[PDB]
Design a protein around this ligand. Sequence first.
Ligand code: ZN
Ligand code: ZN
Lengths: 191, 156
Amino acid sequence: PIDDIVKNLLKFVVRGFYGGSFVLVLDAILFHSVLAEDDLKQLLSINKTELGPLIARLRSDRLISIHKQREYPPNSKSVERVYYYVKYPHAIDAIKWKVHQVVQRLKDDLDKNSEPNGYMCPICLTKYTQLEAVQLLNFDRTEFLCSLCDEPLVEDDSGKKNKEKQDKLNRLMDQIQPIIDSLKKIDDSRI
Amino acid sequence: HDSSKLLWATEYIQKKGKPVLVNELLDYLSMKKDDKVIELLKKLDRIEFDPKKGTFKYLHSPSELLKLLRSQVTFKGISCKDLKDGWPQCDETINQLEEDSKILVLRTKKDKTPRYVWYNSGGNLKCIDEEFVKMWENVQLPQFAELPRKLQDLGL
Ligand SMILES: [Zn+2]
Ligand SMILES: [Zn+2]
């Protein structure tokens, strides 16, 4: 079943960009379709302080949403059981959206450091740019002054940092490859 | 008593913790001199009794740990109580067998990190700096079905 790969993918990201404890609750929720609240509680045998945000993260991750699995109490009351409805369609909605968000962000970091164009005065600790440089450039001053401190300017965003963002990208592409490949394998059916 | 002799002999066998002659077992604690303890050893797993030579044992590797970790798939979560007794200093193996080769559940740094059953693909994956993890937290996963349009807005 492809839905298992979705759950299998959910383990990867919840263990790749999250901790190990983030998958045991993910295991527990997906262990049973309609699982009682206490049954999950006895599995971990720890406090709710180490369990609450894990489900809240998963509900915020939109992979699984706690559903109102209504149960009729036997004591002339109505107390429901907290069974999560694993929201597979929203999983690809949320998780992939971040991947698209981070990749363009790291793409932004690439061209920011790609070539040193903006300038800066270390005395004033303020960045500048070429358009500021030219209007500040003088025939006598072959460099760029800083009228705020009356100091020469220095360049910013040297060529080294462009490699760092690319190396971030290369790690980004490699480390998200198992996530996306397991995500794009779901794109065939959208389940 | 019958149970007190069995309990003391089991602790004494645990205190001895070594395979020795059954005759020496009685004289080590000076209590298991009756056939009741010998029959209890054959009938109870606290004291190991076999038709072979006098020897009582307990009734061990990361490979076994991984298989034991794999032995708890879609089941309850186990503790390292048998893992550390069946393999002393098993917590170190977890540190040595990193990259999911030995997953664990570190409760806290005040109880020797009492671990639990866990298997993973990456396990640690430490090379992703917390800065990427922070921006992962800094970016909040957005709201409801507007998001399929939102990723469509981004071009997905
Ligand atoms: Zn300045
Ligand atoms: Zn929402």
